[PDB]
Amino acid sequence: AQNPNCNIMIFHPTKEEFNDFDKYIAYMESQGAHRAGLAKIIPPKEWKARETYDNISEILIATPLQQVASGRAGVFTQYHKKKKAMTVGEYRHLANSKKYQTPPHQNFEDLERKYWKNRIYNSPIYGADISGSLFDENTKQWNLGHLGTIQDLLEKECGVVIEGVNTPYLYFGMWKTTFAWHTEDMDLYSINYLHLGEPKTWYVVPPEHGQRLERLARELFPGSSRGCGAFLRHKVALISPTVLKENGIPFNRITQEAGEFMVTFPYGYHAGFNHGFNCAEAINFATPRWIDYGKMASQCSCGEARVTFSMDAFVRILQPERYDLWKRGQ
Ligand SMILES: O=c1nc[nH]c2c(CNCc3ccccc3)nccc12
Ligand code: NI
Ligand SMILES: [Zn+2]
């Protein structure tokens, strides 16, 4: 069995290897990459997402989100307070202001320390979940707006045509901007490209141990857990690496830098934070291997984790017994 310790693996595809997306995902899994829940892909030196990022300042962040924390330094939840609209230009200036800027630090390790020590005492503002793409239409390899659709993957595997579209999202980040512990909708894969700016630090639990994370979460957020059997789908719970280590939870960490892709694999729980002003682009995708995961994915039916009309079909075809209840929650 490849990668039995579930280490995060880093790949350096050649330009020829970067042509066929599906084939390279499959190659990665042949080397056991999926066991980690997350892989880093460094593009060939010949490749670029687009020519420059000089002209992105007029992009609108219609609903910037202030991430307000509650709890203790290593075990907290965050809620999203909507803020007034701003452009990327305005957001970048805000991120660089004294109130929000990255503090002086020696290295990524020092900064991670500072993050977990102090995150809860601030409320950074995240330009999250903006429909759009920064890939040039002429970029033919690993263009997140031109991947096979999940709806076509389902159709090809299972024979049924369904409604729905899958498009990418942009994330404009600043220091302490946080993504909570989660797997993707329907335990899909995701791909994340860091277009510009400061790093993004990731934590990931191997898919084979996801239930260990879930158990700890029910213990650490007892009220949330009573409220919903799949509350991690709300995407509000943070648990620090120190707490995971204290509780014997298997996990790994890595820092993503501008120009690098991260792929998360089905049922790979992940969380993390931004080091400073940055922009990432992300989308979900599927492969034939995902279908079994999709069939078994736990659903939030409590009303909190409202999602896109896109998931309807996935639940309806893959999880017919759960569909009615899940629908009531939507
Ligand atoms: O860095 C991040 N900032 C916000 N959400 C993140 C998430 C949430 N899931 C990924 C996703 C986003 C959009 C569409 C489909 C899937 N995963 C990984 C990193 C981040
Ligand atoms: Ni994600
Ligand atoms: Zn719920």
187: closest CA among 227, 232, 146, 245? Answer: 232
Protein residue with least CA distance to atom 9, ligand 1: 184
Query: Is the Cβ atom of 190 under 6 angstroms away from ligand 1?
Result: yes
Ligand nearest to the CA of 299: 3
The CA distance from 243 to 181, in Å, is 13
Residue 92 class from Cβ within 10 Å (0-12 exposed, 13-18 middle, 19+ buried)? buried
Residue 228 annotated in ligand binding: yes
Ligand 3 centre to CA of 10 (Å) is 34
297: closest CA among 206, 187, 204? Answer: 187
Residue 270 annotated in ligand binding: yes
The CA distance from 268 to 255, in Å, is 17
The CA distance from 9 to 285, in Å, is 19
Query: Tokens at residue 329, please?
Result: 């929650």
Q: What ligand 1 atom has the least distance to the C-alpha of 184?
A: 9
Query: Is the Cβ atom of 281 under 6 angstroms away from ligand 1?
Result: no
Protein residue with least CA distance to atom 5, ligand 1: 179
Concatenating the DSSP letter of every residue in 115-136 gives HHHHGGG---EEEEEEE---S-
Concatenating the DSSP letter of every residue in 133-147 gives --S-TT--SS-TTSS
Q: What ligand 1 atom has the least distance to the C-alpha of 173?
A: 3
Q: How far is CA 254 from CA 53, 125, 192, 283, in A?
A: 25, 23, 14, 20
Ligand 3 centre to CA of 304 (Å) is 5
Listed resolution, Å: 1.9
Ranges of each domain in the chain: 1-330
**Fold of the 1-330 domain:** Jelly Rolls (2.60.120)
Residue 200 annotated in ligand binding: yes
The CA distance from 96 to 199, in Å, is 15
87: closest CA among 120, 49, 130? Answer: 130
Ligand 2 centre to CA of 31 (Å) is 22
Residue 302 annotated in ligand binding: yes
Ligand nearest to the CA of 273: 1
The CA distance from 214 to 229, in Å, is 10
Residue 192 annotated in ligand binding: yes
> What is the identity of the amino acid at 119?
R
Protein residue with least CA distance to atom 17, ligand 1: 179
Protein residue with least CA distance to atom 7, ligand 1: 179
Query: Is the Cβ atom of 280 under 6 angstroms away from ligand 1?
Result: yes
Residue whose entry in the numeric block shows the structure tokens 């350096």: 12
